[PDB]
């Protein structure tokens, strides 16, 4: 069901098997560079979310390496790396050796995705910084052109991250908003009283 | 303005629209005064005992000729590179700058850094504009999801030890494999020491303050004893950013 959907949850404890399979996963985890430990990140049940498709994983600092570990542990091969060049309103550019002008987003592939429009966009995003950790909305349009109309899921999203065709998971979302009948049914069967524990 | 959409529409890369791309940089002058004479050696790095390069280096810039650099144009695989004995010539406290390209090297270059005993402290991205040829499509790597418009230079540190982690220039002509000379500016302004090695450098990259070693050099002047004499006492520990010792 096309309109935005979301689930306020602790992503460590949600049974993500109820959500089905997705053409694209995106995550912006709170790396321990309210953070998740390295082991909690490794143990996230990312493998059940896709059979064939792409994972977009935001990283900074030592998560450039830890994120690569998670990506591989979860069954992906890193095949691209998007750079977001951070600018002000006048398109000027805004780790203790160098100032940082950018953030990185690893692109992993699982299986053999068919029918994606690879090569339409380039791997550099030039976009304004907004609030802290707020990622650029340009990535949603890149992902939509890569895989139009398909189901996507975002992990650790905030309210401003919800988007059509996306299901957003995160602990700062407001309640639960689910419209896909497949997902509603499996959510009701798994959480009859709406409580997500353990 | 969505510059991603704009690139889809026009072929102008988003980085084409980045603008402007203390004052007191007399650091540059002290660097130039501190610089050793340029020294250089022709050597087939595959068949060369790297341990002959003495003394141990404070900084190593490593620029192996990856196959991905020759898209329309001896290439080194990451198998070849990983087997270089870089740890045998790096000082116990020292730095490495490894050009990794834009594909599997972003992973295998990190494997190399750890193999040689470094940890990554910076990821420097060379972002390439196409202001002069917006209508010139890529030809993607088979595994690529996106058009690749940048290269990465990884900085590694081993031991107990003004610029930004971005270099922006126009994409060079086909068959031109040179990296932006700005990487030398960044490295030298860290003031890491004066024993500086550039592996797989070329005649075109020879520079004061650097020892350049590579297979395509046409001439050599390297002598290990002469080179070591540049760093004998009282000059053994200079950063390359302070005044010479009288
Ligand atoms: N165990 C957890 N489960 C779900 N969400 C969490 C958890 N821990 C932290 N979070 C949230 O993950 C988000 C991390 C942010 N970096 C995400 C930023 C977001 N991508 C944006 O563009 O604004 C925050 O909302 C955290 O409160």
């Amino acid at each position: 069901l096309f309109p935005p959907q979301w689930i306020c949850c602790d992503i460590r404890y949600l049974d993500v098997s109820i959500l089905g399979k997705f053409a694209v996963v995106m995550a912006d985890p709170p790396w321990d560079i309210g953070t998740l430990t390295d082991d909690e990140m490794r143990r996230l049940n990312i493998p059940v979310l896709q059979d064939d498709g792409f994972l977009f994983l935001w990283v900074t600092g030592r998560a450039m390496e830890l994120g690569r570990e998670c990506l591989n542990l979860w069954g992906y091969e890193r095949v691209d790396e998007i750079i977001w060049v951070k600018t002000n309103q006048l398109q000027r550019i805004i780790g203790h050796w160098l100032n940082h002008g950018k953030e990185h987003c690893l692109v992993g592939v699982k299986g053999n995705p068919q029918g994606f429009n690879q090569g339409l966009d380039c791997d550099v995003i030039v976009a304004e910084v907004r609030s802290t950790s707020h990622k650029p909305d340009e990535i949603y349009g890149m992902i939509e052109r890569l895989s139009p109309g398909t189901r996507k899921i975002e992990l650790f999203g905030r309210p401003h991250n919800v988007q059509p065709n996306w299901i957003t998971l995160g602990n700062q979302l407001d309640g639960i908003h689910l419209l896909d009948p497949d997902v509603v049914a499996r959510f009701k069967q798994r959480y009859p009283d709406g409580i997500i524990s353990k | 303005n969505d510059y991603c959409q704009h690139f889809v529409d026009t072929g102008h890369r988003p980085q084409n629209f980045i603008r402007d791309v203390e004052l007191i940089r007399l650091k540059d002058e002290l660097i130039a005064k501190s610089n050793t004479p340029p020294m250089y050696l022709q050597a087939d790095i595959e068949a060369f005992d790297i341990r002959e390069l003495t003394p141990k280096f404070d900084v190593i810039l490593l620029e192996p000729p990856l196959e991905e650099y020759y898209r329309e144009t001896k290439c080194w695989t990451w198998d070849d590179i990983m087997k270089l004995e870089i740890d045998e010539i790096a000082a116990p406290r020292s730095f490495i700058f490894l050009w990794c390209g834009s594909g599997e090297g972003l992973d295998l270059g990190r494997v190399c850094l750890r193999k040689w005993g470094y940890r990554r402290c910076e990821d420097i991205c060379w972002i390439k504009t196409n202001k002069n040829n917006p209508g010139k499509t890529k030809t993607l790597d088979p595994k690529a999801v996106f058009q690749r418009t940048k290269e990465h230079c990884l900085m590694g540190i081993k031991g107990t030890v003004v610029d930004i982690d971005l270099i922006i220039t126009e994409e060079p002509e086909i068959g031109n494999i040179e990296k932006p000379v700005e990487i030398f500016h960044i490295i030298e302004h860290f003031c890491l020491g004066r024993r500086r090695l550039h592996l797989f450098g070329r005649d075109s990259t020879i520079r004061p303050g650097w020892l350049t070693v590579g297979p395509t050099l046409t001439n050599s002047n390297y002598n290990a004893e002469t080179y070591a004499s540049y760093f004998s006492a009282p000059n053994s520990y200079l950063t390359g950013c302070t005044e010479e010792i009288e």
Side-chain angles (χ1 to χ4, degrees), chain A residues 2-42 44-88 91 93-95 97-130 132-188 190-194 196:
Chain A
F2 281 45
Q5 300 171 89
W6 64 86
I7 307 178
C8 186
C9 52
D10 192 311
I11 288 166
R12 298 175 295 184
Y13 307 136
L14 184 64
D15 180 356
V16 282
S17 65
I18 68 177
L19 298 175
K21 306 297 189 199
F22 297 88
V24 181
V25 173
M26 181 162 70
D28 183 13
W31 305 105
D32 196 1
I33 47 185
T35 77
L36 263 66
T37 76
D38 294 6
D39 274 331
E40 289 171 326
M41 288 304 312
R42 289 172 183 108
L44 293 178
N45 196 7
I46 306 305
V48 73
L49 292 172
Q50 308 191 274
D51 295 319
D52 309 84
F54 295 104
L55 161 84
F56 291 75
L57 181 67
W58 293 93
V59 297
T60 66
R62 71 169 193 101
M64 287 190 201
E65 285 74 39
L66 176 62
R68 271 171 173 82
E69 177 163 327
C70 289
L71 185 151
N72 287 145
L73 294 174
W74 297 332
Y76 294 79
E77 177 190 6
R78 198 204 49 79
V79 288
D80 257 326
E81 180 161 342
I82 295 165
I83 295 310
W84 168 32
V85 182
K86 288 151 103 181
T87 67
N88 62 25
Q91 278 61 254
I93 298 176
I94 308 286
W97 290 94
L98 290 163
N99 299 288
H100 291 167
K102 54 160 168 58
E103 277 188 53
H104 299 232
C105 181
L106 311 181
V107 183
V109 67
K110 184 180 156 177
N112 274 278
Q114 299 191 47
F116 292 62
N117 302 313
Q118 289 162 250
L120 279 178
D121 277 272
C122 76
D123 54 1
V124 171
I125 297 173
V126 175
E128 287 142 22
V129 161
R130 298 174 283 184
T132 304
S133 190
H134 191 178
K135 299 299 182 284
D137 293 338
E138 281 80 351
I139 194 90
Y140 299 114
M142 293 169 69
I143 284 167
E144 200 57 31
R145 289 185 290 280
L146 171 70
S147 193
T150 56
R151 321 174 69 220
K152 294 134 186 123
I153 186 175
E154 185 174 338
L155 306 188
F156 308 97
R158 281 190 286 200
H160 58 223
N161 294 122
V162 310
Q163 306 287 326
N165 291 331
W166 287 75
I167 290 177
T168 315
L169 311 180
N171 67 359
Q172 299 188 300
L173 301 165
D174 193 336
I176 301 151
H177 187 62
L178 293 174
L179 312 171
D180 186 342
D182 293 356
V183 181
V184 168
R186 297 188 297 245
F187 182 90
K188 252 142 89 172
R190 172 70 173 84
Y191 299 117
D193 303 300
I196 298 155

Side-chain angles (χ1 to χ4, degrees), chain A residues 61 65 68 79-80 102 119, chain B residues 107 110 120 123 145 148:
Chain A
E65 285 74 39
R68 271 171 173 82
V79 288
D80 257 326
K102 54 160 168 58
Chain B
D107 311 301
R110 290 176 154 85
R120 184 200 54 78
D123 185 323
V145 186
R148 296 186 175 164

Side-chain angles (χ1 to χ4, degrees), chain B residues 18 49 89 112 121 179 182 187 198 223 239 242:
Chain B
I18 306 166
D49 178 14
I89 58 163
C112 291
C121 43
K179 306 316 174 193
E182 285 87 342
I187 291 164
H198 183 192
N223 177 287
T239 67
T242 60

